[PDB]
Design an enzyme around this catalytic site. Structure first.
Site, PDB file in Angstrom:
ATOM      1  N   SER A 186      54.825   7.207  49.075  1.00 20.85           N
ATOM      2  CA  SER A 186      55.041   8.643  49.034  1.00 20.85           C
ATOM      3  C   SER A 186      54.767   9.252  50.402  1.00 20.85           C
ATOM      4  O   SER A 186      53.908   8.782  51.154  1.00 20.85           O
ATOM      5  CB  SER A 186      54.136   9.294  47.981  1.00 20.85           C
ATOM      6  N   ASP A 211      56.303  -0.869  29.947  1.00 15.91           N
ATOM      7  CA  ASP A 211      55.258  -0.863  30.969  1.00 15.91           C
ATOM      8  C   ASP A 211      55.832  -1.389  32.283  1.00 15.91           C
ATOM      9  O   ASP A 211      55.951  -2.603  32.458  1.00 15.91           O
ATOM     10  CB  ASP A 211      54.079  -1.712  30.493  1.00 15.91           C
TER      11      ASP A 211
HETATM   12  N1  LIG Z   1      50.434  -0.681  33.504  1.00 15.65           N
HETATM   13  C1  LIG Z   1      50.020  -2.030  33.830  1.00 15.65           C
HETATM   14  C2  LIG Z   1      48.988  -2.025  34.956  1.00 15.65           C
HETATM   15  C3  LIG Z   1      47.667  -1.703  34.691  1.00 15.65           C
HETATM   16  C4  LIG Z   1      46.740  -1.702  35.724  1.00 15.65           C
HETATM   17  C5  LIG Z   1      47.138  -2.017  37.013  1.00 15.65           C
HETATM   18  C6  LIG Z   1      46.136  -2.032  38.162  1.00 15.65           C
HETATM   19  F1  LIG Z   1      44.925  -1.555  37.744  1.00 15.65           F
HETATM   20  F2  LIG Z   1      46.010  -3.320  38.596  1.00 15.65           F
HETATM   21  F3  LIG Z   1      46.609  -1.262  39.182  1.00 15.65           F
HETATM   22  C7  LIG Z   1      48.458  -2.337  37.275  1.00 15.65           C
HETATM   23  C8  LIG Z   1      49.384  -2.336  36.247  1.00 15.65           C
HETATM   24  N1  LIG Z   2      48.580  -0.311  31.418  1.00 15.43           N
HETATM   25  C1  LIG Z   2      48.907  -1.223  30.335  1.00 15.43           C
HETATM   26  C2  LIG Z   2      48.265  -0.668  29.072  1.00 15.43           C
HETATM   27  C3  LIG Z   2      49.013   0.142  28.238  1.00 15.43           C
HETATM   28  C4  LIG Z   2      48.440   0.663  27.093  1.00 15.43           C
HETATM   29  C5  LIG Z   2      47.124   0.378  26.794  1.00 15.43           C
HETATM   30  C6  LIG Z   2      46.514   0.972  25.531  1.00 15.43           C
HETATM   31  F1  LIG Z   2      46.837   2.300  25.482  1.00 15.43           F
HETATM   32  F2  LIG Z   2      47.027   0.342  24.435  1.00 15.43           F
HETATM   33  F3  LIG Z   2      45.158   0.819  25.570  1.00 15.43           F
HETATM   34  C7  LIG Z   2      46.367  -0.427  27.631  1.00 15.43           C
HETATM   35  C8  LIG Z   2      46.943  -0.951  28.777  1.00 15.43           C
END
Ligand SMILES: NCc1ccc(C(F)(F)F)cc1
Ligand SMILES: NCc1ccc(C(F)(F)F)cc1
Length: 330
Positions: free
Chosen positions: A199, A35
């Site tokens: 972008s 992630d």
């Molecule tokens: N994949 C992690 C993640 C999930 C949500 C956000 C948000 F909503 F804050 F932009 C940032 C990072």
């Molecule tokens: N963005 C972070 C994140 C990644 C995966 C999930 C899930 F798929 F497990 F729900 C939730 C939040």
């Protein structure tokens, strides 16, 4: 040193990607969601509330000869989708595709939200944003990448996500056989802890490219592409019968439609997302309404270049002292 690991979609829609990770001695292999939008390495464990575990592989620190409890440390995280988890912290040996880090903070979940319990295929997350976002208290911990940086040949990792197919995360080197043309690098702001970049614009299908600055984050942990309402409206206007549905929570379209591609700008270069990448299938089993892979960021507060966009490119996360992001076609 370098590392290389295969990453695999968890289902037929590429909702997420899992990568095997070895933790502890002897190795316990867990499939983690890499992630780049978060900075905690956390796992289902022997400490997780039993009712909250449904098929996941668990980390058992008591069976690892190198695991050490980090006295007094706790963690608690909430993701942008409303998921959350929390627990305590061990240090242990963590290896990804041949690349080993000793003394990595491994955050053991005591409690997880329902969305994690229901995802039997994801054993935890491996965060790859900047360490300033790590939630361990009272002593913040470093990410796997930050811990590995010094010993990597080059302080980079690359994401090569597949469309309905396996892909590759590489650490410490750039595979010049994995992309076509040149890599275009663009500046990153770390001020919010994300791989945040700008972008240079977009195009819908074969239409004219619109030069306009779109600030957003490169997030392997987010499934879809979230962009400003003006851009998203321009895209779905080209799909006959598409509409924003409040009950569904986004744009839907007739499953019989053909979707146009979407182009986004990286400096002077262009990355083309094929229309098929934007189809996320029926909103419910048997429905003829399908869910779109490009949605509005209006309710979120930040634009998110998630898997829909990243899997159309070879992406370099350059963690040099001045960080940059590289994009190439593939
Ligand atoms: N994949 C992690 C993640 C999930 C949500 C956000 C948000 F909503 F804050 F932009 C940032 C990072
Ligand atoms: N963005 C972070 C994140 C990644 C995966 C999930 C899930 F798929 F497990 F729900 C939730 C939040």
């Amino acid at each position: 040193s370098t590392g290389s690991a295969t990453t695999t979609p968890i289902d037929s829609l590429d909702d997420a990607y899992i990568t095997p990770v070895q933790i502890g001695t002897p190795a316990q292999t867990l499939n983690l969601d890499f992630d780049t939008g978060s900075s905690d390495l956390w796992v289902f464990s022997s400490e997780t509330t039993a009712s909250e575990v449904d098929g996941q592989t668990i980390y058992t620190p008591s069976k690892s000869t190198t695991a050490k409890l980090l006295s007094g440390a706790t963690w608690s995280i909430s993701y942008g989708d409303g998921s959350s988890s929390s627990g305590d912290v061990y240090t242990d040996t963590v290896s990804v595709g041949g690349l080993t880090v000793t003394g990595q903070a491994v955050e053991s979940a005591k409690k997880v939200s329902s969305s994690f319990t229901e995802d039997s295929t994801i054993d935890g997350l491996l965060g790859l944003a900047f360490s300033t976002l790590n939630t361990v208290s009272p002593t913040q911990q470093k990410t796997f990448f930050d811990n590995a940086k010094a010993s990597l040949d080059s302080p980079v990792f690359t994401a090569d996500l597949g469309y309905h197919a396996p892909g590759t995360y590489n650490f410490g080197f750039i595979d010049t056989t994995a992309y076509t043309g040149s890599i275009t690098y663009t500046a990153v702001s770390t001020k919010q802890g994300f791989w945040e970049w700008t972008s240079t614009g977009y195009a819908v299908g074969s239409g004219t490219f619109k030069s306009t600055s779109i600030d957003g984050i490169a997030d392997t942990g987010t499934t879809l592409l979230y962009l400003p309402a003006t851009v998203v409206s321009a895209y779905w206007a080209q799909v006959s019968g598409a509409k924003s549905s409040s009950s569904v929570g986004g744009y839907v379209f007739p499953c019989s439609a053909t979707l146009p591609s979407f182009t986004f700008g990286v400096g002077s270069a262009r990355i083309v997302i094929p229309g098929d990448y934007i189809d996320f299938g029926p909103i419910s089993t048997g429905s003829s309404s399908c869910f779109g892979g490009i949605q509005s960021s209006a309710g979120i507060g930040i634009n998110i270049f998630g898997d829909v966009a990243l899997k159309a490119a070879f992406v370099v996360f350059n963690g040099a002292t001045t960080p940059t992001l590289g994009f190439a076609s593939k």
